[PDB]
From a paper:
The plant-type carotene desaturation system is mechanistically linked to redox chains in which quinones, the alternative oxidase PTOX and molecular oxygen participate. This is contrasted by the phytoene desaturases of the CRTI-type prevailing in archaea, bacteria and fungi which are capable of catalyzing the entire desaturation sequence including one cis-to-trans isomerization reaction at the central double bond. For the conversion of colorless 15-cis-phytoene into red-colored all-trans-lycopene CRTI thus takes over the function of at least four enzymes employed by cyanobacteria and plants. The observation that highly purified phytoene desaturase CRTI-His6 from Pantoea ananatis very efficiently converts 15-cis-phytoene into all-trans-lycopene in the presence of FAD and in the absence of any other cofactors or metals speaks for FAD being the sole redox catalyst involved. Since in CRTI-mediated desaturation in vitro redox equivalents are transferred from phytoene via FAD to oxygen the system behaves formally as an oxidase.
Residue numbers in the entry: 1 to 33, 41 to 137, 140 to 194, 197 to 275, 303 to 330, 344 to 425, 456 to 464, 471 to 492
Amino acid sequence: MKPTTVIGAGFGGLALAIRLQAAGIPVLLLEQRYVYEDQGFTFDAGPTVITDPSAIEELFALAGKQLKEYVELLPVTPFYRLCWESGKVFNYDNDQTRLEAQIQQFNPRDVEGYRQFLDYSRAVFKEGYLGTVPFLSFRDMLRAAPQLAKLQAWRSVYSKVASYIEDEHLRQAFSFHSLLVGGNPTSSIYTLIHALEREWGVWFPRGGTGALVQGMIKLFQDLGGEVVLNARVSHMETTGNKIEAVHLEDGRRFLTQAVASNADSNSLFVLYFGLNHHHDQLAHHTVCFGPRLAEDFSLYLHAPCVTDSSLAPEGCGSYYVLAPVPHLGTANLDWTVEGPKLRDRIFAYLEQHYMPGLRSQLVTHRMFTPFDFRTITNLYLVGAGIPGVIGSAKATAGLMLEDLI
Ligand SMILES: [Cl-]
Protein backbone atom coordinates (compact mmCIF):
# COMPACT_ATOMS: atom_id res chain seq x y z
CA MET A 1 0.00 0.00 0.00
CA LYS A 2 1.21 3.55 -0.77
CA PRO A 3 1.80 5.41 2.53
CA THR A 4 -0.48 8.29 3.64
CA THR A 5 1.51 11.53 3.99
CA VAL A 6 1.15 13.87 7.02
CA ILE A 7 2.97 17.17 6.48
CA GLY A 8 4.12 18.86 9.72
CA ALA A 9 1.03 20.41 11.45
CA GLY A 10 2.68 20.20 14.94
CA PHE A 11 0.82 18.23 17.64
CA GLY A 12 -2.23 17.94 15.36
CA GLY A 13 -0.28 16.23 12.56
CA LEU A 14 1.52 13.99 15.05
CA ALA A 15 -1.82 12.93 16.68
CA LEU A 16 -3.36 12.41 13.21
CA ALA A 17 -0.37 10.24 12.08
CA ILE A 18 -0.66 8.17 15.33
CA ARG A 19 -4.43 7.50 14.82
CA LEU A 20 -3.98 6.56 11.12
CA GLN A 21 -0.99 4.28 11.94
CA ALA A 22 -2.90 2.63 14.87
CA ALA A 23 -5.77 1.90 12.44
CA GLY A 24 -3.52 -0.09 10.03
CA ILE A 25 -2.72 2.75 7.58
CA PRO A 26 1.02 3.08 6.68
CA VAL A 27 2.02 6.71 7.41
CA LEU A 28 4.88 8.97 6.39
CA LEU A 29 5.20 11.98 8.71
CA LEU A 30 7.12 14.82 7.08
CA GLU A 31 9.01 17.17 9.41
CA GLN A 32 10.31 20.41 7.75
CA ARG A 33 12.33 21.68 10.85
CA TYR A 34 9.11 24.77 18.52
CA VAL A 35 11.99 23.88 20.98
CA TYR A 36 15.54 25.33 20.69
CA GLU A 37 18.67 24.34 22.61
CA ASP A 38 21.88 26.33 23.31
CA GLN A 39 24.79 25.71 25.78
CA GLY A 40 22.88 23.06 27.79
CA PHE A 41 19.76 25.24 28.12
CA THR A 42 16.48 24.02 26.58
CA PHE A 43 14.09 26.74 25.37
CA ASP A 44 10.44 26.10 24.53
CA ALA A 45 7.74 28.74 24.14
CA GLY A 46 5.36 26.07 22.83
CA PRO A 47 2.38 26.15 25.28
CA THR A 48 3.52 24.08 28.34
CA VAL A 49 0.15 24.35 30.15
CA ILE A 50 -1.40 20.95 30.61
CA THR A 51 -4.62 20.95 32.64
CA ASP A 52 -6.46 18.06 30.87
CA PRO A 53 -4.14 15.27 29.60
CA SER A 54 -7.10 12.93 28.67
CA ALA A 55 -6.88 13.62 24.89
CA ILE A 56 -3.10 12.76 25.05
CA GLU A 57 -3.66 9.60 27.16
CA GLU A 58 -6.38 8.56 24.62
CA LEU A 59 -3.72 8.50 21.79
CA PHE A 60 -1.47 6.19 23.84
CA ALA A 61 -4.51 3.93 24.65
CA LEU A 62 -4.97 3.29 20.89
CA ALA A 63 -1.61 1.42 20.88
CA GLY A 64 -2.52 -0.30 24.16
CA LYS A 65 0.07 1.94 25.92
CA GLN A 66 -0.03 4.53 28.73
CA LEU A 67 1.33 8.10 28.52
CA LYS A 68 3.53 7.57 31.66
CA GLU A 69 5.66 4.90 29.86
CA TYR A 70 6.74 7.63 27.38
CA VAL A 71 6.24 10.98 29.14
CA GLU A 72 6.28 11.94 32.82
CA LEU A 73 3.86 14.79 33.69
CA LEU A 74 4.99 16.95 36.64
CA PRO A 75 2.47 18.82 38.87
CA VAL A 76 2.84 22.64 38.85
CA THR A 77 2.19 24.34 42.25
CA PRO A 78 0.85 27.01 42.54
CA PHE A 79 -0.88 27.10 39.12
CA TYR A 80 0.54 30.62 38.71
CA ARG A 81 1.48 33.71 40.67
CA LEU A 82 0.10 37.25 40.14
CA CYS A 83 2.82 39.88 40.87
CA TRP A 84 2.06 43.54 41.34
CA GLU A 85 4.88 46.10 40.72
CA SER A 86 3.93 47.38 44.24
CA GLY A 87 5.25 44.11 45.85
CA LYS A 88 1.89 42.34 46.42
CA VAL A 89 1.67 38.68 45.41
CA PHE A 90 -1.24 36.25 44.92
CA ASN A 91 -0.58 32.53 44.44
CA TYR A 92 -3.35 30.76 42.59
CA ASP A 93 -4.31 27.14 43.26
CA ASN A 94 -7.54 25.16 44.08
CA ASP A 95 -6.96 24.91 47.88
CA GLN A 96 -9.56 27.09 49.72
CA THR A 97 -7.33 27.11 52.85
CA ARG A 98 -4.29 28.57 51.01
CA LEU A 99 -6.52 31.02 49.07
CA GLU A 100 -8.24 32.26 52.32
CA ALA A 101 -4.87 32.64 54.15
CA GLN A 102 -3.72 34.98 51.31
CA ILE A 103 -7.09 36.87 51.20
CA GLN A 104 -6.77 37.33 55.03
CA GLN A 105 -3.35 39.04 54.43
CA PHE A 106 -4.88 41.53 51.90
CA ASN A 107 -8.10 42.27 53.78
CA PRO A 108 -9.51 40.15 56.72
CA ARG A 109 -13.13 41.18 55.88
CA ASP A 110 -12.68 39.64 52.38
CA VAL A 111 -12.45 35.99 53.70
CA GLU A 112 -16.21 36.15 54.57
CA GLY A 113 -16.82 38.22 51.42
CA TYR A 114 -15.20 35.41 49.41
CA ARG A 115 -17.24 32.62 51.15
CA GLN A 116 -20.43 34.63 50.54
CA PHE A 117 -19.37 35.16 46.90
CA LEU A 118 -18.98 31.35 46.48
CA ASP A 119 -22.29 30.59 48.27
CA TYR A 120 -24.20 33.05 46.01
CA SER A 121 -22.48 31.88 42.79
CA ARG A 122 -23.02 28.16 43.64
CA ALA A 123 -26.73 28.95 44.24
CA VAL A 124 -26.99 30.68 40.81
CA PHE A 125 -25.45 27.69 38.99
CA LYS A 126 -26.88 24.92 41.26
CA GLU A 127 -29.42 23.72 38.65
CA GLY A 128 -29.36 23.27 34.84
CA TYR A 129 -25.59 23.88 34.54
CA LEU A 130 -23.01 21.09 33.80
CA GLY A 131 -17.90 19.89 32.31
CA THR A 132 -14.63 20.81 30.50
CA VAL A 133 -11.37 21.15 32.47
CA PRO A 134 -10.27 24.85 32.66
CA PHE A 135 -7.42 25.73 30.25
CA LEU A 136 -4.93 28.53 31.07
CA SER A 137 -3.84 30.64 28.11
CA PHE A 138 -1.52 33.33 29.36
CA ARG A 139 -0.71 34.21 25.66
CA ASP A 140 -4.37 34.93 24.83
CA MET A 141 -4.78 37.06 28.01
CA LEU A 142 -1.59 39.01 27.14
CA ARG A 143 -2.60 39.53 23.47
CA ALA A 144 -5.73 41.33 24.86
CA ALA A 145 -3.86 42.84 27.94
CA PRO A 146 -3.69 46.62 26.96
CA GLN A 147 -7.52 46.55 26.53
CA LEU A 148 -7.94 43.94 29.43
CA ALA A 149 -9.74 46.20 31.96
CA LYS A 150 -11.52 47.92 28.96
CA LEU A 151 -13.40 44.73 27.88
CA GLN A 152 -17.12 43.88 28.64
CA ALA A 153 -16.13 40.39 29.97
CA TRP A 154 -13.73 42.05 32.53
CA ARG A 155 -16.25 44.83 33.55
CA SER A 156 -19.07 42.28 34.16
CA VAL A 157 -16.93 39.82 36.15
CA TYR A 158 -15.23 42.69 38.08
CA SER A 159 -18.65 44.15 39.16
CA LYS A 160 -19.78 40.64 40.26
CA VAL A 161 -16.62 40.10 42.35
CA ALA A 162 -16.81 43.76 43.67
CA SER A 163 -20.32 43.10 45.12
CA TYR A 164 -18.57 40.80 47.68
CA ILE A 165 -14.85 41.68 47.69
CA GLU A 166 -13.63 45.07 48.73
CA ASP A 167 -9.84 44.73 48.13
CA GLU A 168 -8.66 46.09 44.73
CA HIS A 169 -5.87 43.50 44.24
CA LEU A 170 -8.36 40.70 45.12
CA ARG A 171 -11.02 42.11 42.73
CA GLN A 172 -8.30 42.12 40.01
CA ALA A 173 -6.93 38.61 40.95
CA PHE A 174 -10.39 36.95 40.78
CA SER A 175 -11.45 38.84 37.64
CA PHE A 176 -8.16 37.83 35.93
CA HIS A 177 -8.58 34.14 36.89
CA SER A 178 -12.21 34.16 35.59
CA LEU A 179 -11.06 35.42 32.14
CA LEU A 180 -7.99 33.08 32.16
CA VAL A 181 -9.98 29.85 32.87
CA GLY A 182 -12.74 31.08 30.52
CA GLY A 183 -10.35 30.92 27.57
CA ASN A 184 -12.05 33.61 25.49
CA PRO A 185 -11.87 37.23 26.83
CA THR A 186 -18.14 35.61 28.20
CA SER A 187 -19.82 37.88 30.85
CA SER A 188 -21.10 34.87 32.96
CA ILE A 189 -19.28 34.03 36.25
CA TYR A 190 -19.97 30.27 35.69
CA THR A 191 -16.40 29.67 34.38
CA LEU A 192 -14.71 31.05 37.58
CA ILE A 193 -17.07 28.97 39.78
CA HIS A 194 -17.10 25.76 37.62
CA ALA A 195 -13.27 25.60 38.00
CA LEU A 196 -13.86 24.67 41.70
CA GLU A 197 -16.73 22.12 41.06
CA ARG A 198 -13.89 19.86 39.78
CA GLU A 199 -10.46 18.71 40.99
CA TRP A 200 -7.93 19.98 38.37
CA GLY A 201 -4.27 20.99 38.31
CA VAL A 202 -1.46 22.20 36.09
CA TRP A 203 1.02 19.70 34.64
CA PHE A 204 4.35 20.10 32.86
CA PRO A 205 6.06 17.29 30.90
CA ARG A 206 9.59 16.32 32.19
CA GLY A 207 11.87 17.72 29.42
CA GLY A 208 9.18 20.19 28.37
CA THR A 209 7.45 20.34 24.96
CA GLY A 210 10.35 18.49 23.23
CA ALA A 211 9.94 15.41 25.43
CA LEU A 212 6.16 15.30 24.69
CA VAL A 213 6.93 15.55 20.90
CA GLN A 214 9.63 12.84 21.21
CA GLY A 215 7.33 10.50 23.20
CA MET A 216 4.61 10.89 20.51
CA ILE A 217 7.17 10.23 17.74
CA LYS A 218 8.40 7.11 19.62
CA LEU A 219 4.72 5.96 19.96
CA PHE A 220 4.23 6.62 16.18
CA GLN A 221 7.34 4.58 15.22
CA ASP A 222 6.44 1.68 17.63
CA LEU A 223 3.13 1.52 15.68
CA GLY A 224 5.18 1.21 12.44
CA GLY A 225 5.19 4.79 11.17
CA GLU A 226 8.15 6.54 9.50
CA VAL A 227 9.44 10.07 10.06
CA VAL A 228 11.04 12.11 7.23
CA LEU A 229 13.29 14.91 8.62
CA ASN A 230 14.34 18.24 6.92
CA ALA A 231 11.42 17.64 4.54
CA ARG A 232 10.96 20.97 2.81
CA VAL A 233 7.91 20.44 0.52
CA SER A 234 8.48 21.89 -2.94
CA HIS A 235 5.10 20.82 -4.51
CA MET A 236 2.40 18.14 -4.94
CA GLU A 237 2.18 15.87 -8.00
CA THR A 238 -1.32 15.60 -9.45
CA THR A 239 -3.32 13.23 -11.74
CA GLY A 240 -6.93 14.30 -12.13
CA ASN A 241 -8.34 15.51 -8.80
CA LYS A 242 -5.89 13.39 -6.75
CA ILE A 243 -2.36 13.87 -5.36
CA GLU A 244 -0.07 11.07 -6.68
CA ALA A 245 3.16 12.14 -4.89
CA VAL A 246 4.72 14.67 -2.50
CA HIS A 247 7.92 16.32 -3.79
CA LEU A 248 10.69 17.69 -1.55
CA GLU A 249 13.11 20.60 -2.32
CA ASP A 250 16.11 18.18 -2.09
CA GLY A 251 14.76 16.11 -5.00
CA ARG A 252 12.94 13.31 -3.09
CA ARG A 253 9.54 12.15 -4.37
CA PHE A 254 7.15 10.16 -2.18
CA LEU A 255 4.19 8.31 -3.80
CA THR A 256 1.07 8.74 -1.66
CA GLN A 257 -2.57 7.55 -1.11
CA ALA A 258 -3.54 10.81 0.71
CA VAL A 259 -2.04 14.01 2.08
CA ALA A 260 -2.87 15.72 5.40
CA SER A 261 -1.51 19.21 6.22
CA ASN A 262 -2.15 22.57 8.01
CA ALA A 263 -4.19 25.46 6.46
CA ASP A 264 -2.27 27.10 3.50
CA SER A 265 -5.39 42.43 18.86
CA ASN A 266 -1.80 43.06 20.07
CA SER A 267 1.28 41.16 18.84
CA LEU A 268 3.73 39.40 21.23
CA PHE A 269 7.48 39.91 21.74
CA VAL A 270 9.25 36.69 22.95
CA LEU A 271 12.54 36.79 24.80
CA TYR A 272 14.30 33.53 25.81
CA PHE A 273 17.20 33.76 28.30
CA GLY A 274 19.49 31.41 30.16
CA LEU A 275 21.08 32.31 33.52
CA ASN A 276 23.97 30.72 35.45
CA HIS A 277 21.82 30.97 38.62
CA HIS A 278 18.56 29.23 39.48
CA HIS A 279 15.97 31.78 40.69
CA ASP A 280 14.20 29.39 43.14
CA GLN A 281 11.98 32.29 44.46
CA LEU A 282 9.91 32.33 41.24
CA ALA A 283 6.68 30.48 40.45
CA HIS A 284 6.73 28.40 37.21
CA HIS A 285 4.08 30.75 35.74
CA THR A 286 4.23 34.48 36.64
CA VAL A 287 1.77 37.16 35.56
CA CYS A 288 3.38 40.63 36.05
CA PHE A 289 1.15 43.61 36.66
CA GLY A 290 2.44 47.14 36.19
CA PRO A 291 0.97 50.68 36.14
CA ARG A 292 -0.89 51.59 32.85
CA LEU A 293 -6.72 49.76 40.42
CA ALA A 294 -3.96 51.58 38.45
CA GLU A 295 -2.11 48.35 37.35
CA ASP A 296 -2.65 45.96 34.38
CA PHE A 297 -1.22 42.67 32.89
CA SER A 298 2.11 43.62 31.29
CA LEU A 299 4.52 40.63 31.27
CA TYR A 300 4.36 36.88 31.41
CA LEU A 301 7.41 35.07 32.76
CA HIS A 302 7.89 31.28 32.30
CA ALA A 303 10.41 29.83 34.81
CA PRO A 304 10.08 26.00 34.30
CA CYS A 305 13.23 25.05 36.27
CA VAL A 306 11.32 25.26 39.59
CA THR A 307 9.43 22.14 38.29
CA ASP A 308 12.03 20.59 35.89
CA SER A 309 15.78 21.04 36.47
CA SER A 310 16.67 19.11 33.25
CA LEU A 311 15.85 22.27 31.17
CA ALA A 312 19.15 23.96 32.12
CA PRO A 313 22.63 22.87 33.36
CA GLU A 314 23.21 22.26 37.15
CA GLY A 315 22.73 25.49 39.18
CA CYS A 316 21.32 27.27 36.07
CA GLY A 317 17.96 28.60 34.90
CA SER A 318 16.07 28.65 31.59
CA TYR A 319 13.46 31.40 31.07
CA TYR A 320 11.17 33.16 28.66
CA VAL A 321 9.27 36.41 28.86
CA LEU A 322 6.28 37.53 26.66
CA ALA A 323 5.52 41.29 26.30
CA PRO A 324 2.47 42.66 24.43
CA VAL A 325 3.49 44.81 21.49
CA PRO A 326 1.44 46.69 18.77
CA HIS A 327 0.44 44.51 15.76
CA LEU A 328 3.05 44.40 12.90
CA GLY A 329 2.63 47.36 10.51
CA THR A 330 0.34 49.15 13.03
CA ALA A 331 2.96 51.38 14.77
CA ASN A 332 5.65 51.79 11.98
CA LEU A 333 8.38 50.08 14.11
CA ASP A 334 11.92 48.99 13.22
CA TRP A 335 12.27 45.65 15.10
CA THR A 336 16.04 45.62 14.29
CA VAL A 337 16.45 48.67 16.66
CA GLU A 338 13.23 48.22 18.83
CA GLY A 339 13.85 44.53 19.69
CA PRO A 340 17.31 44.95 21.38
CA LYS A 341 16.00 48.07 23.19
CA LEU A 342 12.87 46.26 24.51
CA ARG A 343 15.00 43.23 25.50
CA ASP A 344 17.35 45.45 27.57
CA ARG A 345 14.38 47.27 29.22
CA ILE A 346 12.81 43.87 30.09
CA PHE A 347 16.08 42.60 31.63
CA ALA A 348 16.44 45.77 33.76
CA TYR A 349 12.78 45.57 34.92
CA LEU A 350 12.93 41.83 35.83
CA GLU A 351 16.23 42.36 37.69
CA GLN A 352 14.93 45.43 39.58
CA HIS A 353 11.68 43.74 40.64
CA TYR A 354 11.88 39.94 40.59
CA MET A 355 15.32 38.50 39.67
CA PRO A 356 18.39 40.01 41.47
CA GLY A 357 21.70 39.86 39.60
CA LEU A 358 19.85 38.88 36.30
CA ARG A 359 22.25 40.69 33.87
CA SER A 360 25.45 39.42 35.52
CA GLN A 361 24.04 35.84 35.25
CA LEU A 362 23.26 35.98 31.49
CA VAL A 363 24.74 33.13 29.46
CA THR A 364 22.52 33.14 26.36
CA HIS A 365 19.40 34.81 24.99
CA ARG A 366 17.29 35.25 21.84
CA MET A 367 14.41 37.48 20.75
CA PHE A 368 11.42 36.79 18.52
CA THR A 369 9.85 40.07 17.42
CA PRO A 370 6.70 40.42 15.16
CA PHE A 371 9.29 40.85 12.24
CA ASP A 372 10.67 37.34 12.95
CA PHE A 373 7.14 35.79 12.78
CA ARG A 374 6.94 36.69 9.02
CA THR A 375 -11.08 20.24 -5.68
CA ILE A 376 -8.46 17.63 -4.52
CA THR A 377 -10.15 14.33 -3.46
CA ASN A 378 -7.33 12.98 -1.24
CA LEU A 379 -6.13 16.24 0.41
CA TYR A 380 -7.16 16.83 4.10
CA LEU A 381 -6.75 19.89 6.37
CA VAL A 382 -5.63 19.11 9.94
CA GLY A 383 -8.14 20.95 12.13
CA ALA A 384 -7.50 24.78 23.97
CA GLY A 385 -3.65 24.38 23.75
CA ILE A 386 -1.83 21.04 23.03
CA PRO A 387 -4.82 18.74 24.07
CA GLY A 388 -7.14 20.91 21.91
CA VAL A 389 -4.84 20.59 18.81
CA ILE A 390 -4.59 16.79 19.45
CA GLY A 391 -8.41 16.46 19.82
CA SER A 392 -9.09 18.22 16.47
CA ALA A 393 -6.89 15.55 14.75
CA LYS A 394 -9.44 12.92 15.94
CA ALA A 395 -12.14 14.30 13.57
CA THR A 396 -9.68 14.40 10.59
CA ALA A 397 -8.59 10.78 11.38
CA GLY A 398 -12.25 9.61 11.34
CA LEU A 399 -12.91 11.31 7.96
CA MET A 400 -9.61 9.98 6.45
CA LEU A 401 -10.26 6.40 7.72
CA GLU A 402 -13.77 6.37 6.07
CA ASP A 403 -12.23 7.35 2.68
CA LEU A 404 -9.16 4.99 3.04
CA ILE A 405 -11.17 1.93 4.31
CL1 LIG B 1 4.56 48.01 13.60
